[PDB]
Design a protein around this motif. Structure first.
Motif, PDB file in Angstrom:
ATOM      1  N   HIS A 233      79.429  -8.762  78.191  1.00 12.10           N
ATOM      2  CA  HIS A 233      80.656  -7.904  78.825  1.00 12.10           C
ATOM      3  C   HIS A 233      81.447  -8.616  79.878  1.00 12.10           C
TER       4      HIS A 233
ATOM      5  N   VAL B 122      83.680  -9.331  82.708  1.00  8.91           N
ATOM      6  CA  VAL B 122      84.025  -8.710  84.168  1.00  8.91           C
ATOM      7  C   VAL B 122      85.488  -9.425  84.440  1.00  8.91           C
TER       8      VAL B 122
ATOM      9  N   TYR C 107      86.297 -11.398  88.145  1.00  9.83           N
ATOM     10  CA  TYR C 107      85.728 -12.731  88.128  1.00  9.83           C
ATOM     11  C   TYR C 107      86.082 -13.650  86.876  1.00  9.83           C
ATOM     12  N   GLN C 108      86.907 -13.055  86.076  1.00 10.01           N
ATOM     13  CA  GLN C 108      87.015 -13.874  84.794  1.00 10.01           C
ATOM     14  C   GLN C 108      85.838 -14.482  84.301  1.00 10.01           C
ATOM     15  N   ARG C 109      84.813 -13.663  84.272  1.00 11.53           N
ATOM     16  CA  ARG C 109      83.494 -14.344  83.900  1.00 11.53           C
ATOM     17  C   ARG C 109      82.815 -13.199  82.967  1.00 11.53           C
ATOM     18  N   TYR C 110      81.449 -13.726  82.478  1.00 10.65           N
ATOM     19  CA  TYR C 110      80.806 -12.527  81.518  1.00 10.65           C
ATOM     20  C   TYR C 110      79.594 -12.219  82.212  1.00 10.65           C
ATOM     21  N   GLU C 111      78.779 -11.118  81.469  1.00 10.61           N
ATOM     22  CA  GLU C 111      77.508 -10.707  82.097  1.00 10.61           C
ATOM     23  C   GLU C 111      76.787 -10.242  80.817  1.00 10.61           C
ATOM     24  N   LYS C 112      75.442 -10.525  80.691  1.00  8.03           N
ATOM     25  CA  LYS C 112      74.580 -10.183  79.380  1.00  8.03           C
ATOM     26  C   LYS C 112      74.554  -8.783  79.615  1.00  8.03           C
TER      27      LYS C 112
ATOM     28  N   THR D 119      78.435 -19.258  93.509  1.00  5.46           N
ATOM     29  CA  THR D 119      78.001 -19.124  92.104  1.00  5.46           C
ATOM     30  C   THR D 119      79.118 -19.446  91.161  1.00  5.46           C
ATOM     31  N   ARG D 120      79.007 -20.334  90.224  1.00  3.84           N
ATOM     32  CA  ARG D 120      80.212 -20.751  89.534  1.00  3.84           C
ATOM     33  C   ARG D 120      80.078 -20.401  88.177  1.00  3.84           C
ATOM     34  N   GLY D 121      79.246 -20.179  87.423  1.00  2.00           N
ATOM     35  CA  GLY D 121      78.819 -20.078  86.040  1.00  2.00           C
ATOM     36  C   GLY D 121      79.426 -19.240  85.378  1.00  2.00           C
ATOM     37  N   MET D 122      79.880 -19.721  84.133  1.00  3.39           N
ATOM     38  CA  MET D 122      80.708 -18.599  83.301  1.00  3.39           C
ATOM     39  C   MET D 122      80.138 -17.395  82.872  1.00  3.39           C
ATOM     40  N   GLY D 123      78.653 -17.385  83.001  1.00  2.00           N
ATOM     41  CA  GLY D 123      77.953 -16.097  82.581  1.00  2.00           C
ATOM     42  C   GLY D 123      77.434 -15.806  83.961  1.00  2.00           C
TER      43      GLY D 123
ATOM     44  N   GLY E  30      78.958 -13.199  85.945  1.00  5.75           N
ATOM     45  CA  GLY E  30      79.692 -12.354  86.316  1.00  5.75           C
ATOM     46  C   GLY E  30      79.102 -11.002  87.155  1.00  5.75           C
ATOM     47  N   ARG E  31      77.940 -10.852  86.507  1.00  9.29           N
ATOM     48  CA  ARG E  31      77.143  -9.605  87.302  1.00  9.29           C
ATOM     49  C   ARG E  31      76.857 -10.074  88.645  1.00  9.29           C
TER      50      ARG E  31
ATOM     51  N   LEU F 279      78.279 -12.257  90.834  1.00 10.12           N
ATOM     52  CA  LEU F 279      79.527 -12.483  91.846  1.00 10.12           C
ATOM     53  C   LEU F 279      79.979 -10.899  92.235  1.00 10.12           C
ATOM     54  N   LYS F 280      79.874  -9.889  90.883  1.00  8.88           N
ATOM     55  CA  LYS F 280      80.580  -8.571  91.488  1.00  8.88           C
ATOM     56  C   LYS F 280      79.532  -8.060  92.070  1.00  8.88           C
TER      57      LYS F 280
END
Ligand SMILES: [K+]
Ligand SMILES: [K+]
Ligand SMILES: [K+]
Ligand SMILES: [K+]
Ligand SMILES: [K+]
Ligand SMILES: [K+]
Ligand SMILES: [K+]
Ligand SMILES: [K+]
Ligand SMILES: [K+]
Ligand SMILES: [K+]
Ligand SMILES: [K+]
Ligand SMILES: [Mg+2]
Ligand SMILES: [Mg+2]
Ligand SMILES: [Mg+2]
Ligand SMILES: [Mg+2]
Ligand SMILES: [Mg+2]
Ligand SMILES: [Mg+2]
Ligand SMILES: [Mg+2]
Ligand SMILES: [Mg+2]
Ligand SMILES: [Mg+2]
Ligand SMILES: [Mg+2]
Ligand SMILES: [Mg+2]
Ligand SMILES: [Mg+2]
Ligand SMILES: [Mg+2]
Ligand SMILES: [Mg+2]
Ligand SMILES: [Mg+2]
Ligand SMILES: [Mg+2]
Ligand SMILES: [Mg+2]
Ligand SMILES: [Mg+2]
Ligand SMILES: [Mg+2]
Ligand SMILES: [Mg+2]
Ligand SMILES: [Mg+2]
Ligand SMILES: [Mg+2]
Ligand SMILES: [Mg+2]
Ligand SMILES: [Mg+2]
Ligand SMILES: [Mg+2]
Lengths: 147, 141, 261, 32, 184
Positions: free
Chosen positions: A92, A94, A97-102, B3-7, B9-10, B12-13
């Motif tokens: 998904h 986000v 933050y221009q990033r992804y979450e599983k 935290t910088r990883g592309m994965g 996202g959770r 950081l939010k």
RNA sequence: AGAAGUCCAUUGAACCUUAUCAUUUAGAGGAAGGAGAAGUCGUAACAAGGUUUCCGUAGGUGAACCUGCGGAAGGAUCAUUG
RNA sequence: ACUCCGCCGGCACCUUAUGAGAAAUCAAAGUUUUUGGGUUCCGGGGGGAGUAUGGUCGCAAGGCUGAAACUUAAAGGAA
RNA sequence: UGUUACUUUGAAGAAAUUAGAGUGCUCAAAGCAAGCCUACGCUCUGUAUACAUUAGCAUGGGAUAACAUUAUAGGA
RNA sequence: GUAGGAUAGUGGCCUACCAUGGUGGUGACGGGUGACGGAGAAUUAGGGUUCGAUUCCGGAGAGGGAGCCUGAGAAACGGCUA
RNA sequence: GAAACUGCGAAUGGCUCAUUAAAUCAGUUAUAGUUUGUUUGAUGGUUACUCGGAUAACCGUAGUAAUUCUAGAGCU
């Protein structure tokens, strides 16, 4: 035999008490076991064409058509009777933050006796009409884990 | 560090979600305690003047700030409302309907007046400004 | 809702009608008929907004109730009758006859016809199947049903229908190399040669069309309408002939027109 | 279930060994 | 009334569903027919969605039953419900539902068998009867129950929906399956 | 053909319990914090602040605080191959 | 054992700025508006307050988790 | 025919609003009109176009990256 | 899961029987919302923050529940029954 | 041509945002899982020179404090 319920299980429209023989007739005629191709490039397993099981929810020998979305996932639970839970893994996005979450979603699916499956195997599921409160998909192919 | 990883996202939010509570401005609006204030999220409020009182100005100033204890009609809470301008307390009588407003600092005390966060805008349906400038007169007598 | 909606708010009406937003709260709700409500042009729009014969909603009723307007050869008195693509509108008193065709900007254009060409229309075949008593029939996308069709006719073909005999005069098979018009979507109103057909099992079929000037565009099979066999359409096209010009090219023509005009 | 896995393992281990013999036999013949 | 909506059910996770609208007429159910075997035939007409009709049979005594192997269908009297795979309480209440095993009168089929094969279980007529007797085969299990005048049959229609109780004569392995359920 | 009425079942308002939860609110008395030009008693913190200060813990005293044990310098020593 | 040269690893120290910093100072506290190697924890003016309440751990002492009302124009760091 | 992400192009996509083309409501906010000449009328008059996360659908690309796989080959 | 019942029709929608499953730190379940959702609105270098009862679209309701007739279409309320 | 019977409509529109947090809703699908007055197109076999009994309006006896509350009689 496959007769394990209180009622006698049989395919609808396949007359088993005909004086004539079924040699030389299409499936479902002359008392021959009925089976069909679901299209979309999927093959009919040999276990469904030559099997003796009765499953009206089977996509190859039952009374359900495959139409809609074709999905893939991994077998998560194979403890129900002819039903499994398929786990679908996706990312998904986000936005802030221009990033992804599983993320994941558990999709119940009917599996016919012609398929063998274990937790961790890869499965392809095709959409069908509601088969139960939660099941809207039918297993079309199983790839054993580590293959 | 961050935290910088592309994965990631959770994480950081969710990290920002927790840390916004540390901000006083954010927490004052999302706590829900504003509804328990005497105005209960309103800009103004009408009330009944209970008594005319004077409050000692805070140091280093020295004066008697003319205020008025007011009971709000909509919820029955009692507040102290400062009466501005010179000799405007003479325009206010006890058991009178007054429109109250904030003092300008969003629920904070203002100036040398101790613990006062409201002021009187109208009395008997007439603005104190009009009475102060002799534009209008209170409806009675 | 507890049933069927009878009103169409003006801002919810199809954009190709080109109704002014401050003209009123409502737009004409298309009646049920051969064409879909989103792909039609009600007679009230045609008579009042396009042809200017009527000045008000009331005057359109007067014109139609005198039996002066015909669609596909039959008199129509319904103000919101859904006239659509390829329909032939005839007004005997004015000796006029139009065919509803899309201009290259996707809007219905009343293409004036000659008396000879106003005796037929083109229809797209929806399906062919057996009816009661095993009698084969085909239905079109304009709501018509034809029994005993030619066995060679299949789905997506185009048939030439004579409005007098009400019979199939000729048909065009759907195949690569024919000239087609786009009847829906972004490319609505564009004419080109069907160059390719990309089938996707279980999904929509895509068709690649090439304009006469080499411009290639794609669309769905459902938005294609064959106009002729080979490269010549069987019907008269408007001036643009389905050639979509760029905004830069269109601005170039406008600039030149002011210099000359 | 136990019989199902026994037959598969027993037959797989059979041909799995036959192929090993055949490959070694083929190699022996290729040297000459 | 009876409703077929999912709003009252628990979610697949187990959580409750808070109600957000009232029951709709387009998701209703109706009382079961509970059709019984009785000579006082009664079928009431029900107006359903779209102005269409359903026939709800409260009591039935005869049915249209087909002998599949012989390809002959005859109207016959329903005698008794003997087996029901869903609920054994529907057997002693003599309820007629789809897939219930019942006994039907064998007399109408005996007449056809005698008229067709000339056998009990005119020169050009005897010419064909003997011709048809060459390929005549009768299941022993199926013939044994012609003596008693009753044939085991399965209801294939839905009496509460169509108002009728039609079926087919059991035979083959299906007959063997059910007669073993009745062997007690 | 069929009303009143009757029988069983279904859907099921409504009311009445006990229980739970939610929100608001009274309370003798106890007790905390803050505010209030210019109260009483000392002087604990700041200088080696007159017993260097501080941390943890424990006990004690009108009050700040005092003392025991281990720790820190943010010490009043970056320093003894003497 | 001692003497000389060097390599790797460790506790540190000394000089220096081409660096950094609010400075004290730091060979890392450098390679940062010329801003991005990876990852965990954690702060958002001063108080109220590590207090109230609920939970949890402990025999207890207490630990861990942890507010609000309200109050205030500073408190604080380096020099 | 191992499965994906990513990227390219395209299709599909309500209007209104936003951006934007045309247009002298006297200007303007707007509106979707109008313009041309002077006949029983004309310009087929105009009422463009772009944008539209994410997910889904379909072509091209295969660097970067993820998962899966490998030696008793159940290999080609 | 099997067989039925009911429905315009799929479906534990309901019944009988059988199996022991289903969801969860990738936050289930529960709680809060001064929460109808969206098209959108305000402010915006960029990213963003806040808002979205209201004329377009979708949903829901007609003092609170429930039940129902008529009808193609309503669990209708400018229809009926409690 | 009033009235009245019959037919149709009154399930649209308008209003509001209380309940509702994978629910509504949005984009995207499916119905080979259904119903659909109407519109449009097509399609419906090889006493009968026309049946029967009612009822409204109307007419006239009314009841009730009272309602598009209501009973009986004569017609068609
Ligand atoms: K952030
Ligand atoms: K609806
Ligand atoms: K001391
Ligand atoms: K000190
Ligand atoms: K001491
Ligand atoms: K060293
Ligand atoms: K159903
Ligand atoms: K079931
Ligand atoms: K109707
Ligand atoms: K109606
Ligand atoms: K949707
Ligand atoms: Mg770093
Ligand atoms: Mg409405
Ligand atoms: Mg399809
Ligand atoms: Mg001292
Ligand atoms: Mg001393
Ligand atoms: Mg001291
Ligand atoms: Mg140094
Ligand atoms: Mg940085
Ligand atoms: Mg703070
Ligand atoms: Mg079922
Ligand atoms: Mg049960
Ligand atoms: Mg909102
Ligand atoms: Mg609300
Ligand atoms: Mg809204
Ligand atoms: Mg509200
Ligand atoms: Mg309003
Ligand atoms: Mg609305
Ligand atoms: Mg409603
Ligand atoms: Mg009200
Ligand atoms: Mg209602
Ligand atoms: Mg009303
Ligand atoms: Mg209404
Ligand atoms: Mg009437
Ligand atoms: Mg909630
Ligand atoms: Mg969902």
């Amino acid at each position: 035999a496959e007769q394990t319920e209180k009622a006698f299980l049989k395919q609808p429209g396949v007359f088993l008490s005909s004086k004539k023989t079924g040699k030389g007739k299409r499936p479902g005629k002359g008392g021959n076991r009925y089976f069909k191709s679901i299209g979309l490039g999927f093959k009919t397993p040999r276990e469904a064409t030559e099997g003796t099981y009765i499953d009206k929810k089977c996509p190859f020998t039952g009374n359900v058509s495959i139409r809609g979305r074709i999905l893939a996932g991994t077998c998560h639970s194979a403890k129900m009777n002819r039903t499994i839970i398929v786990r679908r893994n996706y990312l998904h996005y986000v936005k802030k933050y221009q990033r992804y979450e599983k993320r994941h979603s558990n999709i119940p699916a009917h599996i016919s006796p012609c398929f063998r499956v274990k937790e961790g195997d890869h499965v392809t599921i095709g959409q069908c009409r509601p088969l139960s409160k939660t099941v809207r998909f039918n297993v079309l192919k199983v790839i054993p884990a580590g293959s | 560090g961050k935290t910088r990883g592309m994965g990631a996202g959770r994480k950081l939010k969710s990290h920002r979600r927790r840390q916004r509570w540390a901000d006083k401005s954010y927490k004052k609006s999302h706590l829900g305690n504003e509804w328990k204030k005497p105005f209960a999220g309103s800009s103004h409020a009408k009330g009944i003047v209970l008594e005319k009182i004077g409050i000692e100005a805070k140091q280093p100033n020295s004066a008697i700030r003319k205020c008025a204890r007011v009971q709000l009609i909509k919820n029955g809470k009692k507040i102290a409302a400062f009466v501005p301008n010179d000799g405007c307390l003479n325009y206010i009588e006890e058991n009178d309907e007054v429109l109250i407003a904030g003092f300008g600092r969003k629920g904070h005390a203002v100036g040398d007046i101790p613990g006062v966060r409201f002021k009187v805008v109208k009395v008997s349906g007439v603005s104190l400004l009009a009475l102060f400038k002799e534009k209008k007169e209170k409806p009675r007598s | 809702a507890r049933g069927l909606k009878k009103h169409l708010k003006r801002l919810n009406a199809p954009k190709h009608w080109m109704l002014d937003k401050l003209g009123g709260a409502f737009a004409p709700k298309p009646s049920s008929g051969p064409h879909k409500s989103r792909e039609c042009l009600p007679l009230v729009i045609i008579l009042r907004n396009r042809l200017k014969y009527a000045l008000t909603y009331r005057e359109v009723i007067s014109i139609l109730m005198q039996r002066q307007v015909m669609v596909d050869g039959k008199v129509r008195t319904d103000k919101t009758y859904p006239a659509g693509f390829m329909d032939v509108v005839t007004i005997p008193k004015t000796n006029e006859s139009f065919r509803l065709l899309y201009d290259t900007k996707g809007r219905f254009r009343l293409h004036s016809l000659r008396d000879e060409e106003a005796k037929f229309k083109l229809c797209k075949v929806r399906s062919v199947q057996f009816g009661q008593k095993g009698i084969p029939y085909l239905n079109t996308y304009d709501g018509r049903t034809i029994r005993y069709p030619d066995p060679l006719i299949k789905a997506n073909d185009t048939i030439k229908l004579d409005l007098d005999s009400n019979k199939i005069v000729d048909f065009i098979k759907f195949d690569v190399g024919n000239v087609v018009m786009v009847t829906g979507g972004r490319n609505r109103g564009r004419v080109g040669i069907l160059k390719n057909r990309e089938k996707h099992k279980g999904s929509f079929e895509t068709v690649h069309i090439q304009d006469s000037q080499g411009h290639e565009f794609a669309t769905r099979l459902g938005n294609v309408f064959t106009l002729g066999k080979g490269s010549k359409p069987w019907v008269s096209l408007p001036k643009g002939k389905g050639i979509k010009l760029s905004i830069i090219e269109e601005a170039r023509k406008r600039m030149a027109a002011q210099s000359a005009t | 279930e136990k019989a199902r896995e026994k037959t598969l393992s027993d037959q797989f281990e059979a041909r799995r060994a036959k192929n090993k013999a055949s490959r070694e036999r083929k190699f022996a013949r290729r040297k000459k | 009334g009876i409703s077929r909506d999912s709003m009252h059910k628990r979610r697949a996770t187990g959580g409750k569903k808070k109600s957000w609208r009232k029951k709709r007429k387009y998701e209703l159910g109706r009382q079961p027919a509970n059709t019984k075997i009785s000579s006082n035939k009664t079928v009431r007409r029900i107006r359903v969605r779209g102005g269409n009709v359903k026939w709800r049979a409260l009591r039935l005594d005869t049915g249209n039953f087909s002998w599949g192997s012989e390809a002959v269908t005859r109207k016959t009297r329903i005698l008794d419900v003997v087996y029901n795979a869903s609920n054994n309480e529907l057997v002693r209440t003599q309820t007629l539902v789809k897939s219930a095993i019942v006994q039907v009168d064998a007399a109408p089929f005996k007449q056809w068998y005698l008229q067709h094969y000339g056998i009990d279980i005119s020169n050009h007529v005897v010419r064909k009867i003997e011709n048809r007797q060459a390929d005549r085969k009768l299941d022993s299990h199926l013939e044994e129950q012609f003596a008693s005048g009753r044939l085991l049959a399965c209801i294939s229609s839905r009496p509460g929906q169509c108002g009728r109780a039609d079926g087919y004569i059991l035979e083959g392995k299906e007959l063997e399956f059910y007669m073993k359920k009745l062997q007690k």
